[PDB]
RNA sequence: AGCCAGGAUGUUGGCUUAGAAGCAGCCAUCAUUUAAAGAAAGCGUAAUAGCUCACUGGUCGAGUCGGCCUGCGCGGAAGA
């Protein structure tokens, strides 16, 4: 395994193929072209779900293309369809925006365990619960 | 430099020095913050 | 840093772990990565839980104040960075080798894997353990 | 919350200022059927004492000529602008 | 600009600003700007130092103004000889003896209450100091 | 005092989709892995990135800070 060659990530909802206004220049800032992030990018977008931001590693080399392995979508963007309100934070303590219980977030926590790193399920459970705490969702424990 | 009668520490890297009787404020980051007197 | 009591608590906590322990293993991440941090300590979760305190504070008088009371041979290990990974369940567990095995699995270095104290030995990779 | 204090002999404008410009300041103890007692005491102690909020509530035992008298601070005169006491009234 | 709404007499004597102040204790608010020095504060200075506090602490917090002018100051026009009447009232002042609490704050942090009073003190002529509401 | 030293994956997180994205404007001010890390004190960005400050830290080796009370001095301080 190599050190920091360069590979910085940054992309939008995976369904939106070939993003020029959102990402654009940063996508093909290096010697890697713009067109590859459309054919190869939607190779693993179509398996799980579209209209969902999912991160992928961009380890560029001097050949032409790059090697890559994906991970897992973020906490809050998952907590819109899962939470209910498209909005999240805004004015949490001044005005509690929403609420989620432990039973949902504990169940949603373990599905990311391929990417997520921790000791027990209950360890990551309170973290992935925790990610709700600051979307105005004081966890209903 | 400035020759103001109330020199003071503007940024974090600014440093107060008494050279030859006169109080100066020499700096590393911004050469602007270099200032004499007072 | 906090009061003499707060630091005495941390060492006196470490001394009680040696009383109910046996095998230990060094580890030095001169160029560490927080992805590696969740492998050798993830292991501790796979063993059982939180109790396995790695306690990386081998300062010449900090963790070596507890040395005089428990296992005097560890004073010479003090030089260079070292972490006294104290074990609990299973006499001579598999936690010793995993530091040496992880060192190959993207961790740069690991204190030259010198080891701690069961037969009072030095740098030896030992697969011969109870399993 | 225990302070040693001397008994006053000269008392007025002239004495009190001489005293107040000697790291000390005048106070008085009074209460009950007994007569009042004028009490000279050190400044640098009582200045550090008043920072605690207990000083203006709890009972203080002032040591005078051996005898420890129990009192509470009833009134107090601050110096107009400088952070320092001028006088304290101890109720018994 | 602060000024008395109507008065008995338009013009007042000069007088003498002697003795010590009376509003020494920090009465209403938590903190206060005490006048160490002696002098007189114009109506403009008070407003100028109020604006400097108010804008430093933002909308949050509450401010008191313990001093109020109620003393008219006359001034003679340019190129006018002596006598031929007392001059015309130009501005209004508050006489400040040592010890007088000028301003008092409430509902703010101690570290950020000081920074506000420095900015006020910068506007005033009199040498000032910070004071806290003690007990008794 | 120094000083090879750590100071995270999702946070493009919500919300005015022109991005606000630890540091412009709306509060939260997560909890994990833990030797530690505020979802952040400042710099830097069209925003990121990237430097850091609190701090776990590895050493050296015991005195160090930040205010009061202040008696003498210092600058501010240019004319025929
Ligand atoms: Mg010279
Ligand atoms: Mg008169
Ligand atoms: Mg008066
Ligand atoms: Mg009165
Ligand atoms: Mg006329
Ligand atoms: Mg000092
Ligand atoms: Mg002087
Ligand atoms: Mg000149």
Swiss-Prot record, chain A:
Entry-linked CDD domains: Ribosomal_L11
Protein's UniProt keywords contain Ribosomal protein: yes
SUPFAM superfamilies: Ribosomal L11/L12e N-terminal domain, Ribosomal protein L11, C-terminal domain
GO cellular component: cytosolic large ribosomal subunit
Entry PTM: One or more lysine residues are methylated.
GO BP, one annotated term: translation
Pfam family, one: Ribosomal_L11
Superkingdom classification of source: Bacteria
Keywords assigned: Methylation, Ribonucleoprotein, Ribosomal protein, RNA-binding, rRNA-binding
Example of a GO MF term: large ribosomal subunit rRNA binding
Record-linked PROSITE patterns: RIBOSOMAL_L11 (PS00359)
Function: Forms part of the ribosomal stalk which helps the ribosome interact with GTP-bound translation factors.
Family of this protein: Belongs to the universal ribosomal protein uL11 family.
Subunit field text: Part of the ribosomal stalk of the 50S ribosomal subunit. Interacts with L10 and the large rRNA to form the base of the stalk. L10 forms an elongated spine to which L12 dimers bind in a sequential fashion forming a multimeric L10(L12)X complex.
Protein name per UniProt: Large ribosomal subunit protein uL11
Organism of derivation: Escherichia coli O45:K1 (strain S88 / ExPEC)
Name of the gene: rplK
From Swiss-Prot, chain C:
Biological processes per GO annotation: translation
A GO MF term: large ribosomal subunit rRNA binding
One Gene Ontology cellular component annotation held by this UniProt entry: large ribosomal subunit
Keywords, ordered alphabetically: Acetylation, Ribonucleoprotein, Ribosomal protein, RNA-binding, rRNA-binding
Modified residues (N6-acetyllysine): 37, 105
Protein origin, superkingdom: Bacteria
Subunit structure of this chain's protein: Part of the ribosomal stalk of the 50S ribosomal subunit. The N-terminus interacts with L11 and the large rRNA to form the base of the stalk. The C-terminus forms an elongated spine to which L12 dimers bind in a sequential fashion forming a multimeric L10(L12)X complex.
Protein's job: Forms part of the ribosomal stalk, playing a central role in the interaction of the ribosome with GTP-bound translation factors.
Family: Belongs to the universal ribosomal protein uL10 family.
Name listed for the protein in its UniProt record: Large ribosomal subunit protein uL10
Organism: Escherichia coli O45:K1 (strain S88 / ExPEC)
Residues of the full protein shown: 1 to 131 of 165
From Swiss-Prot, chain D:
Family assignment from sequence similarity: Belongs to the bacterial ribosomal protein bL25 family.
Alphabetical list of HAMAP family matching this protein: Ribosomal_bL25
Coiled coil stretches, renumbered: none
Function comment: This is one of the proteins that binds to the 5S RNA in the ribosome where it forms part of the central protuberance.
GO cellular component term of the entry, any: cytosolic large ribosomal subunit
Protein name, entry field: Large ribosomal subunit protein bL25
GO biological process, one term: translation
Pfam families named in the record: Ribosomal_L25p
Listed InterPro entries: Rbsml_bL25/Gln-tRNA_synth_N, Ribosomal_bL25/Gln-tRNA_synth, Ribosomal_bL25_short, Ribosomal_L25_dom, Ribosomal_uL5_bac-type
Gene: rplY
GO MF annotations, alphabetized: 5S rRNA binding; structural constituent of ribosome
Binding partners and assembly: Part of the 50S ribosomal subunit; part of the 5S rRNA/L5/L18/L25 subcomplex. Contacts the 5S rRNA. Binds to the 5S rRNA independently of L5 and L18.
Keyword annotations: Ribonucleoprotein, Ribosomal protein, RNA-binding, rRNA-binding
Domain of life according to the entry: Bacteria
From Swiss-Prot, chain E:
Cysteine disulfide partners in this protein: none
Signal peptide: none
Domain of life: Bacteria
InterPro entries membership: Ribosomal_uL16 (IPR047873), Ribosomal_uL16_bact-type (IPR000114), Ribosomal_uL16_CS (IPR020798), Ribosomal_uL16_dom (IPR016180), Ribosomal_uL16_sf (IPR036920)
Any one GO cellular component localisation term in the record: cytosolic large ribosomal subunit
A Gene Ontology molecular function term of the record: rRNA binding
Function statement: Binds 23S rRNA and is also seen to make contacts with the A and possibly P site tRNAs.
Subunit structure: Part of the 50S ribosomal subunit.
Protein name: Large ribosomal subunit protein uL16
Organism: Escherichia coli O45:K1 (strain S88 / ExPEC)
